[PDB]
């Protein structure tokens with residue numbers, strides 16, 4: 001159906017998204033950045049709001 005995720009590649013180090021989704025997004029030591037590991041940790045309204053909170057928006061939904 002509809003998916004999504006991020007590329008901690010363009011993630012500076014702010015928890016802006018992590019807050020709008022302290023369950024799906026969360027920076028790590030391997031990616032020393034926030035990564036959408038748990039898509040269920042953030043609802044579309046939450047995961048989304050957090051995505052709009054990012055400065056560069058290093059996140060992208062995955063349809064396929």
Ligand code: SF4
Pocket residue numbers: 006008010011012013014015016017018025027033034050053054055056057058
């Ligand atoms: S909102 Fe954007 S810059 Fe801040 S941790 Fe999440 S991915 Fe990183």
